[PDB]
Amino acid sequence: SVTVKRIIDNTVIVPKLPANEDPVEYPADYFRKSKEIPLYINTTKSLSDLRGYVYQGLKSGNVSIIHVNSYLYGALKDIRGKLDKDWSSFGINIGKAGDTIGIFDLVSLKALDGVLPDGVSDASRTSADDKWLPLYLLGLYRVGRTQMPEYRKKLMDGLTNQCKMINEQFEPLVPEGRDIFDVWGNDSNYTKIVAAVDMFFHMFKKHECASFRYGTIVSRFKDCAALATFGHLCKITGMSTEDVTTWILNREVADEMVQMMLPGQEIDKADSYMPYLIDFGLSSKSPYSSVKNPAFHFWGQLTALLLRSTRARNARQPDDIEYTSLTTAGLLYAYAVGSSADLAQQFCVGDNKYTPTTNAPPQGRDVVEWLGWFEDQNRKPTPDMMQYAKRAVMSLQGLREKTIGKYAKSEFDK
Amino acid sequence: SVTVKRIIDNTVIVPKLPANEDPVEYPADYFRKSKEIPLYINTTKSLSDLRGYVYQGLKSGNVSIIHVNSYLYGALKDIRGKLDKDWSSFGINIGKAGDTIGIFDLVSLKALDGVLPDGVSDASRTSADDKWLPLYLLGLYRVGRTQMPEYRKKLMDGLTNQCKMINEQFEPLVPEGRDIFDVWGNDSNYTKIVAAVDMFFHMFKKHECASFRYGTIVSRFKDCAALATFGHLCKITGMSTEDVTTWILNREVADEMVQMMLPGQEIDKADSYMPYLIDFGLSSKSPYSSVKNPAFHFWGQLTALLLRSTRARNARQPDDIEYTSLTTAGLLYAYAVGSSADLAQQFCVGDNKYTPTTNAPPQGRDVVEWLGWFEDQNRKPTPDMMQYAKRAVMSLQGLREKTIGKYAKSEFDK
Amino acid sequence: QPDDIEYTSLTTAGLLYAYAVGSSADLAQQFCVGDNKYTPTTNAPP
């Protein structure tokens, strides 16, 4: 199916569609071009003065993103963290034996020369610097991500985390809805500060300042939901990554899986640059998102739900995928995992036990056995499995519009 | 069918029709003649003065298109944008390794010498120049395109995008209906500024000023709707570009497809001149429009609709195409994709599964199998597929006059 | 409507042409992958 030809004259046509912006980019294929990640910390002038600049700025108004970045770099310039063994990623070396590397041990580079108020602000603010203020600035990135009334319930947990031998209060007052601190999300340099904080403390989990993580955590695997759903599927089915892979039954789910499992990406690595591929600006279009894995996401999350996931209840229903074909596939998988137990001997003392009506479903969880069974069922889902799917979806309550939960209850519980 | 002859005397007649203006032109066949794209920026006199000239002009009145062009070139003369790898299109080189190319790195050339008010206008306007005013001038091109009450709903989203660390207000007051800023559309030079802005930031997506894009986006693939509908068909059927191609069943859809898929056009290229073929004045008659692909557009969009597209609902019904023949073709395609699932094994562990009443439709989605089936159905659409077509179109609501949605519901839901 | 032409003869001709184009669809394969499909009551039209 490479070559297509016009039959009336015997000539060749080459089908080609307008590529949806940039391809997939990939983390690895980036470090092929550059060896560093540019952190443009603009002003490097007076660190004590900056503390007051951000404090008075945040207290209702337009605090400069350039300001807070300059502050965070000054406040988090702690060269703490005793390297346990060795640290290397995508070829870039960061640590050896007993190295004492800090948090900004990737590139810094100076930028611009335009600043706002000029010099020493209000000397009002005492130290209590590193202690809570950095937590807040990083904590607003977590709050800025969302857009529903969950904000005034996640900012609530912001204020109650700046009391760890601190206890102060709050700062701004204006409701979110993307307007105030949300500007920061689209700042290449800000996001780079948050990603380097999460990465540093993912390595140094036992560090005192590792509390900065919650607020900066939402950056690890940002736009990598498909990968998360693949892990969730393994946990919920109890099968191995290999077995689950063999249960892919649609062509365009296979494609997506292959896309996600490209060999040289360090996705299974403990402490890598890979999970921060977006916020470190390594990739303009993640290979691992739901958006670029729509068939896989729907299929995986539908099965997950039939199998009694509570996550899946509220997953997004993608657009432009073959719902009918995908849904019957997910049903077979879920029906197979749900019906009939395994029960096999695991350990012995030199003494084992070997194991070996008509429309009866197969013994175990092997794809080939079930595939053969589905053929003999006229390639249509049985009454038993439809009743299984019903039982699974009914008594789900208050499911939101455009979720897989809403799709699944509506499909299977008439 | 090349030669035709008169039978009574044995002489030759050559059928030939008056060609509808110019043929198809094509982007490639343009750079065969010229190596540059002329940008005639007339006046290159005083950039600070121009800021006031456009501001007071737009505040109700006739602001000169020559003025705003002179302004935009001055304001957007930012030589920003660090080139990632390499940039080349249709033979014209623009970038290499680590080049620092700006937004007007295609031709500029000076023009005329007639200007309006003379010298320094009102020094009223501060900087806030590049920050929001260029966004507006470019944003009026988006608003100018349309002609229905959608204007006062797309100009609403104009004003709310000039607040990104800006927040001002508005400018003119007069309703659109093509009269005020609509003149600009037919300005070769203005359209060239918008197209170079969209192209620059399609490459530099991560740039700060990339917000100018929304407003200038409607230029990428202007008059290339047929290409968009071909992509949409692939997404909605889930088939490949090659498979979809084989499902063309009308002679005049084949012709159109062939026209669109001409080999040397860079249509599948990431960052090319091709999508701006109209606004950069590369083509006087797009090969890729609905107007020049009427059979394909109708066929593609009808199928798309039967398959549950929400886009297609409101697509234009072209004129002078074989509705009857086209519609029965689209029906077969949609009926084939809708009925009967695929279900095939994708991955293995050295262990595969091979797959192999009377008027029963074919197994899968192969054209030959369905074509054979349609013959045996007396070359007329079955009751089952007519009932499929009904179910598909009924309960569609408020469909506009002269759309494919209106055609389809009226054909299939009596 | 012109003058001095054979309306009767002309009109029956036009009818045949229009009737032929209106009744019965075409439906033929246009593109392939090395895999074609060859196509081949009484007063039934052609």
UniProtKB/Swiss-Prot annotation, chains A, B:
This is Nucleoprotein. Keywords: Capsid protein, Helical capsid protein, Host cytoplasm, Ribonucleoprotein, RNA-binding, Viral nucleoprotein, Viral RNA replication, Virion. Encapsidates the genome in a ratio of one N per nine ribonucleotides, protecting it from nucleases. The encapsidated genomic RNA is termed the NC and serves as template for transcription and replication. The nucleocapsid is bullet-shaped with the tip containing 8 turns of a conical spiral before reaching the helical cylindrical trunk. Nucleocapsid assembly is concomitant with replication, therefore viral replication depends on the intracellular concentration of free N, termed N(0). All replicative products are resistant to nucleases. It is found in: Virion; Host cytoplasm. GO terms for biological process: RNA replication; viral transcription. It comes from the Viruses. The gene is N. Residues 349-382 are annotated as: Interaction with the phosphoprotein. It holds the Pfam family Rhabdo_ncap. GO terms for cellular component: helical viral capsid; host cell cytoplasm; ribonucleoprotein complex; viral nucleocapsid. Homomultimerizes to form the nucleocapsid. Binds to viral genomic RNA; this interaction contributes to the virion assembly. N in the nucleocapsid interacts (via C-terminus) with the P protein (via C-terminus); this interaction allows to package the L polymerase in the virion and positions the polymerase on the template, since P acts as a bridge between N and L. N(0) interacts with the P protein; this interaction prevents the uncontrolled aggregation of N(0). Interacts with the matrix protein (inner layer); this interaction contributes to the virion assembly. Interacts with the L polymerase. It comes from Vesicular stomatitis Indiana virus (strain San Juan) (VSIV). Belongs to the vesiculovirus nucleocapsid protein family. RNA binds at R142, Y151, K205, R213, K285, R316, R400. The keyword Ribonucleoprotein applies. GO terms for molecular function: RNA binding. InterPro entries: Rhabdo_ncapsid, Rhabdovirus_ncapsid_C, Rhabdovirus_ncapsid_N, Rhabdovirus_nucleoprotein-like. The keyword RNA-binding applies. Its main location: virion.
